[PDB]
Amino acid sequence: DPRVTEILERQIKADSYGASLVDLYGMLQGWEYCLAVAAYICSIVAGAALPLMTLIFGDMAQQFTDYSSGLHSNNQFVDKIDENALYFVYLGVGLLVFNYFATLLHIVVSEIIASRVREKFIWSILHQNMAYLDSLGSGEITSSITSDSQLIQQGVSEKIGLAAQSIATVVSALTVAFVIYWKLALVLLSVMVALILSSTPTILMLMQAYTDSIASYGKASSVAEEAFAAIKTATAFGAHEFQLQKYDEFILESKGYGKKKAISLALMMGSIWFIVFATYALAFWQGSRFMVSDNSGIGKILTACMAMLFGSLIIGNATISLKFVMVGLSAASKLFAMINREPYFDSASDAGEKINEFDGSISFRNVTTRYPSRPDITVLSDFTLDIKPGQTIALVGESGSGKSTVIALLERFYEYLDGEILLDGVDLKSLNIKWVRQQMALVQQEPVLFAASIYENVCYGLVGSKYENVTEKVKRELVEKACKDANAWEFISQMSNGLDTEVGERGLSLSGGQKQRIAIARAVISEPKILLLDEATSALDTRSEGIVQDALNRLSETRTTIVIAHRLSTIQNADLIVVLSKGKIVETGSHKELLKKKGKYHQLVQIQNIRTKINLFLMLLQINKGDYYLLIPCLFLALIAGMGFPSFALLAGRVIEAFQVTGPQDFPHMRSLINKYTGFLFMIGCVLLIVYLFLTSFMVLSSESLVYKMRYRCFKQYLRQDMSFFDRPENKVGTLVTTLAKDPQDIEGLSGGTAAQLAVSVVIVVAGIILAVAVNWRLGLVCTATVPILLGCGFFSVYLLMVFEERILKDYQESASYACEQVSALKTVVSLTREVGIYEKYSNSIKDQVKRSARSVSRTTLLYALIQGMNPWVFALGFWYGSRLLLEGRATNREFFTVLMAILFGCQSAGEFFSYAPGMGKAKQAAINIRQVLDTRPKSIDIESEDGLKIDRLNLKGGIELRDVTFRYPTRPEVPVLTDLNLIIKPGQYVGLVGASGCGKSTTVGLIERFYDPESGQVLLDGVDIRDLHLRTYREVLALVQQEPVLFSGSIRDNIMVGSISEEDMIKACKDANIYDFISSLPEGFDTLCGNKGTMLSGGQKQRVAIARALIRNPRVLLLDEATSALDSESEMVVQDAIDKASKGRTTITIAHRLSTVQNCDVIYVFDAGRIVESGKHDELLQLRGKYYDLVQLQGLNA
Ligand SMILES: COCC(CCO[C@H]1CC[C@@]2(C)C(=CC[C@H]3[C@@H]4C[C@@H]5O[C@]6(CC[C@@H](C)CO6)[C@@H](C)[C@@H]5[C@@]4(C)CC[C@@H]32)C1)COC
Ligand SMILES: COc1ccc(CCN(C)CCC[C@](C#N)(c2ccc(OC)c(OC)c2)C(C)C)cc1OC
Ligand SMILES: Nc1ncnc2c1ncn2[C@@H]1O[C@H](COP(=O)(O)OP(=O)(O)NP(=O)(O)O)[C@@H](O)[C@H]1O
Ligand SMILES: [Mg+2]
């Protein structure tokens, strides 16, 4: 027990890992480290040189004020201005150079790190033991290959460079502000820190609201998942409003939390602007108060104020960039957990022995095995067997005996706890695993061919052979010979290219017969010593089976072979047959020997013989008409913003002019002016605050509303679709749930909030331009011509960042798809030992991709650096022109700084709208997908349409008639299920539809319920076609009891009343279902929760609840689609008691696999390939000695 349990956990134990940036940045080797260092240095420099613009602005402001006061001569003013303009030019050039190098080197280093991570991941995944790989959920490895490596690459991409730039900018801004003027900087820092620690409550509230909304939509998404999975039951019982009301109850909680989200976002975005203008006014006021003692001047006050705000504003950029770093580290924590895990079997190394002159003899001695997933069941117990060279052995038995467990033990996929497996007397645990797998050839039931030429697919089996590295002509001859010996040359010659044709997604797609023969050729070409045939003809068509079986027999006449045959006629001439029952060998010997013993083999042969004998924005705005009451004020607060920012610029210009003091004699007057305007700069600062407290709020509210509708309607548009919509491969339950999660959420980027923000930004930009032109037309015209440049730069910074974000995902697609292809077929890869070749191909692909990607990036990084450096040049031109204007008297210091602050506000307000650009990158896509979903309408089976003859209960006879019905499943229209089916149920008949499996007897339920319409033919209820009846009332007449009982999450009373068409009909139905006793025995009454929690119920009680649900509506036609073909024998009797009572008094159509139930049917119909072969009662069918007789004999033997 201790050793066994330790082995079973160690085979599957996935140890966790906590990754950091040390692990990610240690992927560099040697001279690559310098690149990383260089990148960071550049980033830091590109962040430290940015707040020097505040220094140069302060110096130019001081020069302008001094010249206006009359302190210095024209020549001095011109020379100083020109020197400051040169300083802007130098700063712009430096910003360009360092931004280029920082971005390029960060991207290159991220490419290198992620490529190393990808290589290590694929190498590690390929060489894990199969037990761990099976444990990994479906699609986990492919998601780690495709969508977890991009996150790692982003975490160390230019995003971390921008985070470092933001931190450096904050540090440098604080340093500049404290070095130039420390007293005012200290006062401003104290006030800002106080106002931030005072806004910590609002941030906490916003994060809480986000978390609560996420949880509420998680509950809503669980309701959506259960409805889609149980869409048949909901369609049959008309539970399309019940599911929608359970969904709407949870997407109305998300709206309630979105109202807190809106309030918190409005408060936070108002606090951020309160800090801005409060600091501005306080800086100017306290600087004037300190000037009466320091003579600091306007320059130092402006430098300190600008540096403080600059530093604070960039804190937001650091947080957004650091989000990517945190997400990347979490993805690394995942990928490094798997990369570091050591496999249970050391197949990567070359440790082990290699048998020379391998004969091909195998020996199992008391082999015992328990799978790691289920450590309590012994799948294989005391397995003993000896296979001499040349002996073809056959493993037979019922499903779950453990036949494929022997092959899994041989191939080292799983570990055997006790016993001993010997290859020519050498223990299997002391042999090289890759060599062991090379000495065998595994031919599975489902053949896997990879996306390559048939020549390459066949050569995939030459790994580790003596012919692995030979001249290509010898390889071509070998492939030709192997394809001839596999009966594959015949159809290969027919194809145009021949051996070079590409079998895979791209190129021709072959039938199982061709794919299986190519797999046989790939197996034979290696000349194996042991052949493992695991049902190589199980899924094959009967006609194809002949050619392939011939190939398999010719292959296996001369090698040690272990045949697991689905058809026992193929293994009659096997040298030895072993019968397995629950992992134990019951008998072994020749065909004639076992038959004379009349044991399990005799029964299996008899059953086989019997079976053989029987056989865009305006659209969403129009949808959300409610936003019309959130767009009447938003065009009035915008007007207020358009009259508040120009006023703010005017006041700022007046305050700067007030500082034109020649000496200490002007300090009193200045102070008075400073005071007065600083009052207005507050009174107009608060008004705008109020606007933000409303405006942002409305934005978020609007968005929330839209999302809610885009959820509700979308769900209401999925429940409307007919079953053919849900049969399509794309419309999986998980896919539809993910679409409901994503698209309604993502369409929030083109809501009324975006329109309001765009309108506000446009109004502010236009108001700034108008104010600048009115104040001084000579200056406003240049401001009008610099604003297009200053806005394009701000937009294209975001656009190029988006391009950098998209490149990572769009570039590693030709290579991630290859890895997902070779990993989705991982047992085939492992058994061929194609692990090294796949590693070499994938590594070469991504190594080429790195070199391509660096040169791809450099071109865009050039433009990004140019845009980043553009701003100081614009400021230099503006200041030079302004100084030339003050020279000629055509402008005033007040007018110049009013224009400057106006264009500053315009560019800061238009940069709020550009941050919406990434969102509209996805929202647009979402919008078009949602429009298709809303427009999707079922062809004929529509529940919402009120067109059709309604049914009258008084005249409702309840008879059914399928007249000349033929039907094909739309997914596979080639294969017919029903052909020319003529069938009649008279009213009140208890009819049973028995038949061989695959006869399409269960499709009659779908046709009567009108899940589908017949391709050609008619279905009539009481002489009236069902296509002319109202679907809702028709389905209310019917009732359905499915094979596996479905109970939607909720109380027992709710599930039982789903089929209600008074609290006493429900009791009566529960009594008729023999379930009321169990209900009264529950801790509570009918309020007990069943779905997904509460008192769990057995299959019998679930089926009885389903029967009561069907019974409440008092149906005239009860459709029992194998209501007991899921129950154990003991439970089946009470469920059958419930079923028999329901049949009395109404038309009942029972499809049953256990023909004991249908023994009391008035008329029994037997199906065969979709047509009614035999009809009549039980005794007459028995006397007929036909297909029903064979079925009852088969059921008697099968047990
Ligand atoms: C699951 O959660 C998902 C998440 C939900 C929202 O999370 C919030 C977390 C806090 C965070 C990052 C958010 C918005 C504004 C951010 C603030 C701006 C302020 O600016 C400063 C500096 C400048 C000052 C003037 C004002 O204060 C900072 C101290 C303040 C700040 C950086 C503190 C952190 C805030 C988003 C994202 O969803 C898209
Ligand atoms: C022109 O291109 C851009 C220009 C500026 C920006 C920066 C965006 N700003 C940080 C938005 C500031 C928002 C904010 C408000 N309200 C604000 C701050 C300062 C402002 O003037 C100094 C301001 O004027 C409206 C607004 C604060 C809440 C932060 C980005 C740009 O591209 C994304
Ligand atoms: N990876 C696994 N983890 C746990 N149990 C497993 C695993 N694989 C198979 N089993 C169970 O082990 C038993 C034997 O499985 P298996 O060896 O596949 O039998 P089989 O006779 O080859 N099946 P079949 O090919 O359908 O006739 C059954 O109970 C299986 O459900
Ligand atoms: Mg099997």
Domain spans of the chain, in order of start = 16-180+296-343+777-890, 960-1198
Q: Which two tokens stand for residue 1077?
A: 């006793």
How many CB atoms are located within 10 Å of the residue 589 CB? 16
CA 420, CA 424: separation in Å to the nearest integer?
Answer: 12
CA 757, CA 754: separation in Å to the nearest integer?
Answer: 5
Report the candidate in 454, 527, 450, 518 with the shortest Cα–Cα distance to residue 486. Answer: 518
Binding residue per annotation — 538? no
**Where do runs of H (alpha helix) occur along 181-199?**
182-197
- Output the CA 743–ligand 2 centroid distance in Å: 29
1002 to 729, 968, 1123, 1170: CA distances (angstroms): 21, 13, 12, 10
Mutate which of 192, 193, 195, 210 to test ligand 1's pocket (most atoms within 8 Å of Cβ)? 210
**Where do runs of H (alpha helix) occur along 453-496?**
454-459, 472-485, 489-494
Which are the contacts of 947, defined by CB distance < 8 A and separation ≥ 6?
Answer: 1030
3-class SS of residue 1012: coil
CA 623, CA 1116: separation in Å to the nearest integer?
Answer: 42
CA 136, CA 372: separation in Å to the nearest integer?
Answer: 13
| CB-based contact 779:902 (threshold 8 Å) | no
1148 to 725, 987, 993, 1107, 1108: CA distances (angstroms): 28, 9, 11, 13, 15
How many CB atoms are located within 10 Å of the residue 719 CB? 20
Binding residue per annotation — 534? yes
Ligand 2 atom with the shortest distance to the CA of 309: 22
DSSP state of 366: E
Q: Which two tokens stand for residue 1157?
A: 């139930």
- Output the CA 912–ligand 2 centroid distance in Å: 6
Is the C-alpha dihedral spanning 449, 452, 454, 459 positive or negative? negative
- Output the CA 379–ligand 3 centroid distance in Å: 7
How many CB atoms are located within 10 Å of the residue 806 CB? 11
CA 803, CA 921: separation in Å to the nearest integer?
Answer: 11
- Output the CA 717–ligand 1 centroid distance in Å: 36
CA 446, CA 1028: separation in Å to the nearest integer?
Answer: 45
Mutate which of 202, 276, 640, 897 to test ligand 2's pocket (most atoms within 8 Å of Cβ)? 276
Say which residue the tokens 């489902």 belong to. 446
Per-residue exposure over 376-396, b if at least 16 CB sit within 10 Å of its own CB, e if not: eebbbbebebebeeebbbbbb
CA 1116, CA 972: separation in Å to the nearest integer?
Answer: 33
- Output the CA 401–ligand 3 centroid distance in Å: 7
- Reported as type and span, the H/E element at residue 963 is strand 960-969
Report the candidate in 155, 315, 148, 130 with the shortest Cα–Cα distance to residue 823. Answer: 130
Please tell me the number of the ligand nearest to residue 533's CA.
4
Report the candidate in 429, 425, 408 with the shortest Cα–Cα distance to residue 359. Answer: 425
CA 6, CA 1045: separation in Å to the nearest integer?
Answer: 39
Strand partners, 421: 364
CA 751, CA 915: separation in Å to the nearest integer?
Answer: 15
Mutate which of 692, 783, 912 to test ligand 2's pocket (most atoms within 8 Å of Cβ)? 912
Sequence letter at residue 596:
K
| Cβ of 766 below 6 Å from ligand 1 | no
Sequence letter at residue 1131:
S
329 to 400, 524, 543, 841, 1005: CA distances (angstroms): 43, 47, 56, 28, 53
Report the candidate in 348, 329, 562, 540 with the shortest Cα–Cα distance to residue 447. Answer: 540
- Output the CA 994–ligand 3 centroid distance in Å: 30
* Resolution of this deposited model, Å: 3.2
Is the C-alpha dihedral spanning 991, 996, 1002, 1007 positive or negative? negative
Q: Which two tokens stand for residue 66?
A: 């001094």
CA 285, CA 680: separation in Å to the nearest integer?
Answer: 12
| CB-based contact 296:37 (threshold 8 Å) | no
Breaks (C-N over 2.5 A) in the chain follow: 615, 1061
Report the candidate in 940, 949, 1119, 943 with the shortest Cα–Cα distance to residue 1031. Answer: 943
**Where do runs of H (alpha helix) occur along 298-342?**
298-340
Which are the contacts of 479, defined by CB distance < 8 A and separation ≥ 6?
Answer: 455, 458, 459, 499, 521, 525
DSSP state of 539: S
Q: Which two tokens stand for residue 1079?
A: 């209900």
CA 1047 to chain centre: 27
Measure the N-to-C terminal CA separation of the chain; round to a whole number of Å.
34
Report the candidate in 359, 364, 378 with the shortest Cα–Cα distance to residue 409. Answer: 364
- Output the CA 371–ligand 3 centroid distance in Å: 9
Q: Which two tokens stand for residue 714?
A: 């979308």
Ligand 3 atom with the shortest distance to the CA of 403: 22
- Output the CA 22–ligand 1 centroid distance in Å: 27
Mutate which of 405, 533, 567, 584 to test ligand 3's pocket (most atoms within 8 Å of Cβ)? 405
CA 943, CA 1035: separation in Å to the nearest integer?
Answer: 10
Half-sphere exposure of 426 (CA within 13 A, CB side): 15
Report the candidate in 1190, 7, 6, 167 with the shortest Cα–Cα distance to residue 615. Answer: 1190
- Reported as type and span, the H/E element at residue 274 is helix 240-294
Please tell me the number of the ligand nearest to residue 396's CA.
3
| Cβ of 414 below 6 Å from ligand 3 | no
Strand partners, 564: 534
Kindly report the CATH number that applies to the domain delimited by 16-180+296-343+777-890. 1.20.1560.10
Which are the contacts of 1124, defined by CB distance < 8 A and separation ≥ 6?
Answer: 1103, 1132, 1135, 1136, 1139, 1152, 1154, 1157
What does the CA dihedral 531, 534, 536, 537 come to, rounded to 10 degrees? Answer: 140
Report the candidate in 713, 701, 736 with the shortest Cα–Cα distance to residue 248. Answer: 713
What does the CA dihedral 515, 518, 519, 521 come to, rounded to 10 degrees? Answer: 160
Report the candidate in 112, 115, 125, 106 with the shortest Cα–Cα distance to residue 39. Answer: 106
| CB-based contact 786:902 (threshold 8 Å) | no
Exposed (0-12), middle (13-18) or buried (19+): which is 234, by Cβ within 10 Å? Answer: buried
3-class SS of residue 203: helix
- Output the CA 411–ligand 4 centroid distance in Å: 14
- Output the CA 535–ligand 4 centroid distance in Å: 7
- Output the CA 456–ligand 4 centroid distance in Å: 28
Please tell me the number of the ligand nearest to residue 193's CA.
1
| CB-based contact 401:583 (threshold 8 Å) | yes
Say which residue the tokens 């949602």 belong to. 930
Report the candidate in 701, 689, 614, 556 with the shortest Cα–Cα distance to residue 262. Answer: 701
Mutate which of 198, 203, 689 to test ligand 1's pocket (most atoms within 8 Å of Cβ)? 203
| Cβ of 444 below 6 Å from ligand 3 | no
Ligand 2 interacting residues, C-beta cut-off 6 A: 269, 272-273, 276, 313, 692, 790-791, 794, 797-798, 905, 907-912, 914-915
Residues with C-beta atoms within 5 A of ion ligand 4:
404
- Reported as type and span, the H/E element at residue 60 is helix 52-69
Q: Which two tokens stand for residue 90?
A: 């130098």
960-1198 to CATH, choices 3.10.105.10, 3.40.50.300, 2.40.50.100, 3.40.309.10: 3.40.50.300
Please tell me the number of the ligand nearest to residue 397's CA.
3
Ligand 3, atom 1: closest residue by C-alpha: 371
- Reported as type and span, the H/E element at residue 1164 is strand 1163-1168
CA 861, CA 854: separation in Å to the nearest integer?
Answer: 10
What does the CA dihedral 733, 737, 740, 743 come to, rounded to 10 degrees? Answer: -100
| CB under 8 A, 24+ apart: contacts of 1126-1130 | 1126/1043, 1126/1044, 1126/1045, 1126/1099, 1127/1099, 1127/1100, 1127/1103, 1128/1099
3-class SS of residue 1173: strand
DSSP state of 353: B
1165 to 921, 995, 1147, 1170, 1176: CA distances (angstroms): 59, 8, 15, 12, 7
Please tell me the number of the ligand nearest to residue 563's CA.
4
| CB-based contact 1007:962 (threshold 8 Å) | yes
DSSP string, 876-898: HHHHHHHHHHHHHTS--HHHHHH
Ligand 3 atom with the shortest distance to the CA of 399: 27
| Cβ of 319 below 6 Å from ligand 1 | yes
| Cβ of 376 below 6 Å from ligand 3 | no
**Where do runs of H (alpha helix) occur along 230-239?**
231-237
687 to 9, 260, 647, 651, 903: CA distances (angstroms): 66, 23, 11, 14, 20
Ligand 2, atom 30: closest residue by C-alpha: 911
| CB-based contact 54:176 (threshold 8 Å) | yes
